[PDB]
């Protein structure tokens, strides 16, 4: 009737040896366990890896996995599959280290249907994984191949395929460019993305360096060089270098940044010298794009945590640490003044959208929506606000009190009065365009005490807020502003589960059209 806050020992106890060829069973009933986001059956998960779609339309998600602990270490490649990026099936571990003093760090996977690698004489469904093997003294790039659709991998006989004699050289992202393979890889502590080329994925030639761009933090990680279509014109696209930095992000710990530019097969040249942060909150890192997608779709998934507190979050009693972000559709757009912007929207949520909890058209009202009866404890909401053309042509017409206040309130059934999360936007006044996203300290004993668990985040719009999409999923809130122009991923660990949300609008100009839609989400587990 209420989601368990602690699980039986059977569900939380980790084995002393790594299971091979068997699906690790998971209890997904925890009060903090997300129901539409991916999380491992048990153990510790970090970066997504080897993300690709096979020819039959199955999306493969691999991930950094510690099967033995609820902290980072003993890295293997976990594996889950999905047709829709929401209904996940857990698979046996896909890539193992050679021994117990080695770890399988991040990497990518590609289809090799034309058998450029020479691994696939009798199949057009060959998968090649390119990943970092970590040793006490070295980080080297290794190749493994799968003839069975990416469930079981055989190491390349002549591994490693690439080394620079460094233990700060990792996160290979490989893709096809016209007539050759490209590898983007991080010389992490030199703030350099090295680009290599190959005809066969085993012989790598240095092409170019991308160094000392944007925020340095303490390290470049998980580079992604991808072609992203324009939001308003699918026929147009630009190249984007996405770099994860950890530690040393402005909000502390880990953050993603991106650089729009040109790629010609050997060199990436940023259009300008500007730094652009992907997410205005703290809990979005190591975004990886899916290889071999259909229809020029840019599909990404990120790790929904921060390295400053990911190994301390209070979910280990619920048999997991860390979830992935919602899968994302990516576009590029120009926003007023700022220009280049990476758009992020949730990938088609239709497969998980349950019955409507509220549809409202009232301006200057408070909508109270109870979802104690939604067993997932997960809701989607959409708020459209269309100001009259008068208020767009003369912003001085907008009242200083013109505001949107969204609050997520604790459950009356399943447990002090503090909201678990707040969203505040002002159209005008002294903080015009300021959007505040908060996880109040007062709502979480754990969050209050953790010295890196920041309570408050903000983004300032130039254009008025016209659209707001949100997904709440037990311990996670994702917000998308003005068709994904601005995006924030925020973990919440309230003492009491959320059971309710209030949506207040106030001081809106005469003739403002407000449309509020709220739907419960169906659990994927």
Ligand X SMILES: *[C@H]1O[C@H](CO)[C@@H](O)[C@H](O)[C@@H]1O
Ligand Y SMILES: OC[C@H]1O[C@@](CO)(O[C@H]2O[C@H](CO)[C@@H](O)[C@H](O)[C@H]2O)[C@@H](O)[C@@H]1O
Ligand Z SMILES: *[C@@H]1O[C@H](CO)[C@@H](O[C@@H]2O[C@H](CO)[C@@H](O[C@@H]3O[C@H](CO)[C@@H](O)[C@H](O)[C@@H]3O)[C@H](O)[C@H]2NC(C)=O)[C@H](O)[C@H]1NC(C)=O
Ligand U SMILES: *[C@@H]1O[C@H](CO)[C@@H](O[C@@H]2O[C@H](CO)[C@@H](O)[C@H](O)[C@H]2NC(C)=O)[C@H](O)[C@H]1NC(C)=O
Does 122 contact ligand NAG by CB under 6 A? Answer: yes
Does 96 contact ligand X by CB under 6 A? Answer: yes
Does 321 contact ligand Y by CB under 6 A? Answer: no
Does 70 contact ligand X by CB under 6 A? Answer: yes
Q: Could you tell me the strand order of the sheet in which 378-386 lies?
A: 353-360, 513-521, 378-386, 467-473, 476-481, 486-491
Parallel/antiparallel/unpaired status of strands 255-263 and 233-245: antiparallel
Does 7 contact ligand Y by CB under 6 A? Answer: no
| Choices 65-73, 84-92, 185-193, 300-308; region in contact with ligand U by CB under 6 A | 185-193
Residue 462 touches which of ligand NAG, ligand U, ligand Y, none (Cβ within 5-8 Å per kind): none
Largest distance between two CA atoms of the chain: 71
**130 vs 326, which CB is nearer to ligand U?**
130
User: C-beta of 192: minimal distance to ligand U in Å?
Assistant: 4
How many other CB atoms sit within 10 Å of the CB of residue 106?
A: 28
Buried b vs exposed e over 74-92: b needs ≥16 C-beta within 10 Å? bbbbbbbbbebbbebebbe
**187 vs 345, which CB is nearer to ligand U?**
187
How many other CB atoms sit within 10 Å of the CB of residue 149?
A: 16
Q: Contacts with ligand Y in 273-292 (CB under 6 A)?
A: 286
| Choices 277-285, 289-297, 300-308, 390-398; region in contact with ligand NAG by CB under 6 A | 390-398
Residue 293 touches which of ligand NAG, ligand Y, its own copies, none (Cβ within 5-8 Å per kind): none
Among 14, 72, 138, 164, binds ligand Z (CB under 6 A): 164
Does 103 contact ligand U by CB under 6 A? Answer: no
Does 266 contact ligand NAG by CB under 6 A? Answer: yes
How many other CB atoms sit within 10 Å of the CB of residue 319?
A: 27
Does 269 contact ligand NAG by CB under 6 A? Answer: yes
How many Cα neighbours within 13 Å face the side chain of 307? 19
Of 15, 33, 521, the closest CA to residue 304 belongs to 33
Does 266 contact ligand Z by CB under 6 A? Answer: no
Does 164 contact ligand U by CB under 6 A? Answer: yes
CA distances (Å), origin 420, targets 439, 470, 492, 495: 6, 15, 7, 9
| Gapped junctions in the chain, after residues (C–N > 2.5 Å) | 415
**219 vs 485, which CB is nearer to ligand Y?**
219
x-or-dash pattern for ligand Y, window 37-76, by CB under 6 A? Answer: ---------xx----------------x-------x--x-
Among 20, 101, 122, 336, binds ligand X (CB under 6 A): 20
E-assigned strand segments in 336-399 = 339-346, 353-360, 366-370, 378-386
CA distances (Å), origin 466, targets 208, 457, 461: 42, 20, 11
Does 106 contact ligand Y by CB under 6 A? Answer: yes
CA 18 to CA 299: how far, in whole Å?
31
Does 209 contact ligand Z by CB under 6 A? Answer: yes
CA 22 to CA 40: how far, in whole Å?
14
Q: Are 26 and 523 in contact (CB under 8 A)?
A: no
Does 13 contact ligand X by CB under 6 A? Answer: yes
Residue 307 annotated in ligand binding: yes
Does 167 contact ligand U by CB under 6 A? Answer: no
Residue 240 touches which of ligand Y, ligand U, ligand Z, none (Cβ within 5-8 Å per kind): none
Does 317 contact ligand X by CB under 6 A? Answer: yes
User: C-beta of 7: minimal distance to its own copies in Å?
Assistant: 23
Residue 203 annotated in ligand binding: no
> Over 162-206, what HEC string results?
ECCCCCCCEEEEEEEECCEEEEEEEEHHHCEEEEEEECCCCCCEE
Residue 166 touches which of ligand Y, ligand U, ligand X, none (Cβ within 5-8 Å per kind): ligand U
Kindly state the helix (H) or strand (E) to which residue 446 belongs, with its residue range.
helix 445-449
Does 8 contact ligand X by CB under 6 A? Answer: yes
Of 467, 457, 407, the closest CA to residue 434 belongs to 457
Q: Are 176 and 151 in contact (CB under 8 A)?
A: no
Given the rule CB under 8 A, which residues bind its own copies? 71-72, 189, 191, 211-216, 218, 247-253, 270, 272-277, 308-309, 311-312, 337-339, 422, 424, 430-431, 433-434, 436, 438, 440-442, 448, 451-460, 462
Bind-site residues: 46, 75, 106, 170-171, 307
Bind-site residues for beta-D-fructose: 46, 75, 106, 170-171, 307
Given the rule CB under 6 A, which residues bind ligand Z? 164, 166, 169, 187, 190, 192, 194, 209, 211
């Amino acid at each position: 009737s209420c989601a368990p806050t602690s699980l039986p020992a059977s569900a939380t106890e980790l084995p002393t040896t790594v299971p091979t060829g068997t699906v690790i069973t998971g209890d997904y009933t925890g009060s903090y366990r997300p129901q539409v986001h991916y999380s491992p059956p048990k153990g510790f998960m970090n970066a997504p890896n080897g993300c690709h779609r096979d020819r039959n339309g199955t999306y493969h998600l691999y991930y950094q996995y510690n099967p033995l602990e609820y902290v980072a270490g003993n890295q293997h490649w976990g594996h889950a599959t999905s047709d829709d990026l929401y209904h996940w099936t857990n698979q046996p571990i896909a890539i193992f280290p050679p021994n117990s003093t080695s770890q399988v760090f991040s990497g990518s996977a590609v289809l090799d249907p034309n058998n450029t690698s020479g691994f696939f004489p009798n199949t057009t469904d060959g998968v090649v994984a390119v990943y970092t093997l970590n040793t006490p003294t070295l980080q080297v790039q290794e190749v493994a191949y799968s003839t069975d659709g990416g469930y079981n991998f055989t190491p390349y006989e002549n591994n490693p395929v690439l080394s620079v004699g460094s233990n700060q050289f990792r996160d290979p992202k490989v893709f096809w460019y016209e007539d050759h393979w490209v590898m983007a890889v991080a010389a992490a502590n030199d703030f350099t993305i090295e680009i290599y080329t190959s005809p066969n994925l085993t012989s790598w030639t240095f092409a170019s360096n991308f160094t000392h761009h944007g925020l340095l933090g303490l390290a470049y990680e998980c580079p992604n060089l991808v072609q992203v279509p324009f939001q308003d014109d699918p026929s147009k696209s630009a190249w984007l270098m996405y770099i994860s930095i950890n530690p040393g992000a402005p909000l502390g710990g880990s953050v993603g940044q991106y650089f729009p530019g040109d790629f010609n097969g050997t060199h990436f040249v940023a259009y300008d010298s500007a730094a652009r942060i992907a997410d205005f909150a703290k809990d979005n890192y190591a975004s990886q794009w899916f290889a071999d997608t259909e229809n020029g779709e840019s599909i990404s998934i990120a790790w929904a945590s921060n390295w400053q507190y990911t190994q301390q979050v209070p979910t280990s009693a619920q048999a997991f640490r860390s979830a992935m972000s919602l899968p994302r559709r990516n576009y590029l757009t120009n926003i007023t003044r700022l220009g280049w912007d990476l758009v992020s929207l949730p990938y088609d949520l239709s497969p998980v959208v349950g019955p409507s909890l509220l549809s409202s058209s009232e301006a200057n009202s408070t909508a109270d929506v109870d979802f104690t009866n939604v067993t997932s404890n997960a809701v989607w909401f959409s708020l459209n606000v269309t100001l009259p053309d008068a208020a767009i042509q003369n912003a001085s017409l907008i009242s200083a009190d013109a505001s949107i206040n969204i609050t997520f309130l604790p459950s009356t059934k399943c447990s002090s009065d503090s909201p678990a999360a707040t969203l505040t936007y002002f159209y005008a006044g002294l903080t015009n365009g300021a959007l505040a996203l908060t996880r109040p300290a007062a709502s979480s004993s754990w969050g209050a005490e953790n010295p890196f668990f920041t309570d408050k985040f903000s983004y300032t719009l130039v254009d008025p807020l016209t659209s707001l999409v949100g997904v709440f999923d037990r311990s996670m809130l994702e917000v998308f502003v003005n068709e994904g122009a601005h995006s924030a991923t925020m973990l919440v660990f309230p003492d009491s589960p959320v059971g309710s949300m209030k949506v207040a609008t106030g001081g809106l100009p005469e003739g403002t059209q407000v449309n509020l839609q709220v739907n419960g989400l169906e659990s994927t587990w």
